[PDB]
Amino acid sequence: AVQYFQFYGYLSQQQNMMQDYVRTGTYQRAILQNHTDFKDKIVLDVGCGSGILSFFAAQAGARKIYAVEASTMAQHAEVLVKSNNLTDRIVVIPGKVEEVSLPEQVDIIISEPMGYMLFNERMLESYLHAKKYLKPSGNMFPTIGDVHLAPFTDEQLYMEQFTKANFWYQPSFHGVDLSALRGAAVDEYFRQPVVDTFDIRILMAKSVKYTVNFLEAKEGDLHRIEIPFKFHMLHSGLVHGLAFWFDVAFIGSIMTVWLSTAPTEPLTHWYQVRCLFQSPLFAKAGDTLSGTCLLIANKRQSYDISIVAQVDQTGSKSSNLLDLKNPFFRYT
Amino acid sequence: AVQYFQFYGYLSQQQNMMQDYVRTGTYQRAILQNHTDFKDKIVLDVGCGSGILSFFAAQAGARKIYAVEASTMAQHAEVLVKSNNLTDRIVVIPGKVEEVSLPEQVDIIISEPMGYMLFNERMLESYLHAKKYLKPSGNMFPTIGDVHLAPFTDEQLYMEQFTKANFWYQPSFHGVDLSALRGAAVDEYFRQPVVDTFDIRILMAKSVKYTVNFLEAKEGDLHRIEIPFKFHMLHSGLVHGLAFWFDVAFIGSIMTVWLSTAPTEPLTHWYQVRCLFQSPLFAKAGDTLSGTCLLIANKRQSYDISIVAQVDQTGSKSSNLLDLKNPFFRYT
Numbered sequence: 081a082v083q084y085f086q087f088y089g090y091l092s093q094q095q096n097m098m099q100d101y102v103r104t105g106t107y108q109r110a111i112l113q114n115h116t117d118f119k120d121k122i123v124l125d126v127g128c129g130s131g132i133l134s135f136f137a138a139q140a141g142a143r144k145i146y147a148v149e150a151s152t153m154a155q156h157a158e159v160l161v162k163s164n165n166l167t168d169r170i171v172v173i174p175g176k177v178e179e180v181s182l183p184e185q186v187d188i189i190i191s192e193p194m195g196y197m198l199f200n201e202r203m204l205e206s207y208l209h210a211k212k213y214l215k216p217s218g219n220m221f222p223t224i225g226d227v228h229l230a231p232f233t234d235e236q237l238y239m240e241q242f243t244k245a246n247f248w249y250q251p252s253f254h255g256v257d258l259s260a261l262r263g264a265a266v267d268e269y270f271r272q273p274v275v276d277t278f279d280i281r282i283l284m285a286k287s288v289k290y291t292v293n294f295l296e297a298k299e300g301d302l303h304r305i306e307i308p309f310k311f312h313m314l315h316s317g318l319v320h321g322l323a324f325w326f327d328v329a330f331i332g333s334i335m336t337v338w339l340s341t342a343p344t345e346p347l348t349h350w351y352q353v354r355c356l357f358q359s360p361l362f363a364k365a366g367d368t369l370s371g372t373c374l375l376i377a378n379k380r381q382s383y384d385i386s387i388v389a390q391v392d393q394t395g396s397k398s399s400n401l402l403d404l405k406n407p408f409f410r411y412t
Numbered sequence: 413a414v415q416y417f418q419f420y421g422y423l424s425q426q427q428n429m430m431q432d433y434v435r436t437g438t439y440q441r442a443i444l445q446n447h448t449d450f451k452d453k454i455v456l457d458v459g460c461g462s463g464i465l466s467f468f469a470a471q472a473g474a475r476k477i478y479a480v481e482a483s484t485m486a487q488h489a490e491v492l493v494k495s496n497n498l499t500d501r502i503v504v505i506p507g508k509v510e511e512v513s514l515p516e517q518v519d520i521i522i523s524e525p526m527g528y529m530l531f532n533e534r535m536l537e538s539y540l541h542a543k544k545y546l547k548p549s550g551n552m553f554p555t556i557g558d559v560h561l562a563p564f565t566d567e568q569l570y571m572e573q574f575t576k577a578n579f580w581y582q583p584s585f586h587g588v589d590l591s592a593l594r595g596a597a598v599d600e601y602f603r604q605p606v607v608d609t610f611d612i613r614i615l616m617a618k619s620v621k622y623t624v625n626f627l628e629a630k631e632g633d634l635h636r637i638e639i640p641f642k643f644h645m646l647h648s649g650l651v652h653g654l655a656f657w658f659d660v661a662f663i664g665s666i667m668t669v670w671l672s673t674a675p676t677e678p679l680t681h682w683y684q685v686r687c688l689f690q691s692p693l694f695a696k697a698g699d700t701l702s703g704t705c706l707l708i709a710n711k712r713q714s715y716d717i718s719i720v721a722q723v724d725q726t727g728s729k730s731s732n733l734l735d736l737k738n739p740f741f742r743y744t
């Protein structure tokens with residue numbers, strides 16, 4: 081938790097995030113296209129970072145914005161509030177949203193709590209916790225999250241896991257036989273979710289969607305996420321694993337604005353995530369690939385990912401158990 | 413500590429380290445050129461990782477090697493011991509060297525406990541702690557460590573710190589004036605030690621040396637390290653900061669073998685480290701640059717670095733306080 085809050089305390093990290101043009105532009109459009117939803121309202125910005133969303137709320141004419149930030153980035157937000165002449169309208173509160181006092185309830189909660197595969201962020205539970213401050217009528221921005229799963233074919237990604245483990249084949253590394261660890265090295269590589277982008281031509285079926293309604297979801301809902309799937313295969317070939325991405329919708333009174341991390345959309349700093357099966361499955365177009373993706377919260381502000389899949393027409397099955405704490409950042 | 417031991421638990425990390433050819437080749441030469449110092453002896457390998465140093469001790473004819481490893485890498489070391497037919501001669505002990513039981517005292521301790529700038533590794537104190545197991549006559553490999561400091565001139569590195577902060581000059585970033593944070597952003601960049609290599613032509617004086625004798629040093633000695641310097645300037649120009657590197661010597665009965673991370677030597681995964689002054693100092697050839705580098709252990713298994721320097725002939729002075737927990741990895 082010291083490491084988590086140290087990470088977010090750096091202006092270099094805020095700069096890196098603010099340079100995702102899709103992320104910045106989409107949040108600004110969501111808030112300002114729905115300006116009637118903010119004008120003269122009370123706003124809570126959960127994990128405000130440098131404060132940009134609180135400035136967007138102010139741009140839309142919000143009367144009072146409580147900007148809550150647990151890292152030392154709170155001191156930098158406070159400098160921008162003063163320098164942009166908004167000490168009347170933005171109140172920066174240093175601390176955890178679970179531990180601070182707000183002097184009143186709010187019309188709307190705004191946040192950017194999304195991790196890789198949507199869920200990989202201790203902030204999303206904190207976002208749902210913040211609803212204790214929301215008036216009964218109140219809204220959340222974002223309002224819903226859709227996680228998308230689709231089967232992919234990519235023998236280059238599959239074969240890379242073996243190639244990276246080739247080091248361990250050496251029978252005389254400075255007189256040591258390393259070969260007994262080659263299997264363990266391959267296994268370790270297979271248990272890392274792969275963060276990068278890819279051509280949509282690797283996707284073999286239309287995605288399945290798991291929707292979280294942030295207006296309705298409770299903190300505890302995110303501890304165990306079970307996503308059944310049945311894919312109608314549109315392509316014939318080896319299925320190497322599942323690809324993951326997410327959309328969030330800001331459901332305003334004037335319009336719904338989408339932030340999509342789909343591989344059909346401009347690239348974001350979320351990229352996409354791929355989880356290999358331990359062994360690939362042959363599917364023909366018209367086959368069904370059925371199974372379950374289970375995300376179980378672990379104590380590392382991350383998730384164990386269990387995937388089981390079978391081709392219904394053959395009974396051929398595979399699985400994997402991955403740790404989203406140790407992702408492989410493959411993007412170059 | 414969970415993060416530290418998770419990091420070292422990965423075969424991918426052991427592979428990365430084992431592919432530093434200078435590191436592997438130098439440890440093998442040190443041990444095998446001094447084979448008479450290992451033959452029929454009892455050895456302790458502190459933080460053995462995959463076990464390579466224990467295999468090198470075995471190559472030199474050691475009778476019994478206790479290989480102590482606190483991470484899950486201990487299970488992988490045990491697989492190599494079995495597969496290389498050395499269960500008679502190498503005993504893998506899972507746990508911290510501070511907490512485990514050895515059944516006997518040892519002739520020699522071998523380890524690779526060196527971090528950036530030598531000291532940046534919770535293992536070096538653990539290496540000195542291990543001496544509780546060393547026979548009075550006993551040796552340590554490595555035996556001594558030399559940290560080298562030298563003044564450097566590099567206006568490209570200096571100007572980069574301002575260039576990276578340029579983002580924050582924006583008077584209308586999506587309608588927000590970021591400029592009040594530009595100073596803070598520059599300051600943050602200046603407080604990161606820079607890990608990369610450089611041409612020796614940037615060094616303006618012969619290095620000063622701080623020596624740690626691992627045979628004599630106590631655990632507590634490493635909490636506060638004070639390095640006074642007086643440089644005899646050999647070049648005229650702006651001094652932008654201090655450059656750091658280190659050598660360790662394996663002082664065997666047959667020969668002394670050096671592992672050097674100097675910028676005059678083949679590159680290692682330690683590279684070199686540079687700490688900027690907040691403001692550069694003009695020195696002419698023949699001037700003296702005097703001051704102190706103070707390393708104070710912090711609770712992040714790292715060090716605060718305080719540097720003060722003055723050109724004696726002008727009185728012009730500068731300083732910085734850096735955090736070795738947040739280094740900038742600039743090498744490309």
Ligand SMILES: NCCCN(CCNC(=O)NCc1ccccc1)C[C@H]1O[C@@H](n2cnc3c(N)ncnc32)[C@H](O)[C@@H]1O
Pocket residue numbers: 085088089097098103104107126127128129130131132133148149150151153175176177178191192193194195201202203206
């Ligand atoms: N992708 C996940 C990025 C998540 N960040 C959000 C950073 N906010 C941000 O960039 N806003 C501006 C923006 C600009 C453009 C578009 C969108 C937003 C998390 C932020 O919350 C902080 N935190 C975590 N847990 C808690 C807690 N319990 N209470 C209070 N603060 C907490 C944490 O220190 C950090 O500053």
Ligand SMILES: NCCCN(CCNC(=O)NCc1ccccc1)C[C@H]1O[C@@H](n2cnc3c(N)ncnc32)[C@H](O)[C@@H]1O
Pocket residue numbers: 417420421429430435436439458459460461462463464465480481482483485507508509510523524525526527533534535538
């Ligand atoms: N540069 C710093 C790299 C430091 N590593 C050393 C890894 N050893 C290694 O590569 N040896 C093989 C080798 C090959 C070629 C040349 C040289 C060596 C630290 C290793 O000690 C482990 N650890 C840390 N603190 C403790 C402790 N208290 N007790 C026991 N184990 C502890 C930690 O998990 C990790 O496995």
Ligand code: NA
Pocket residue numbers: 233234235236
């Ligand atoms: Na292919």
Ligand code: NA
Pocket residue numbers: 565566567568
């Ligand atoms: Na120059």
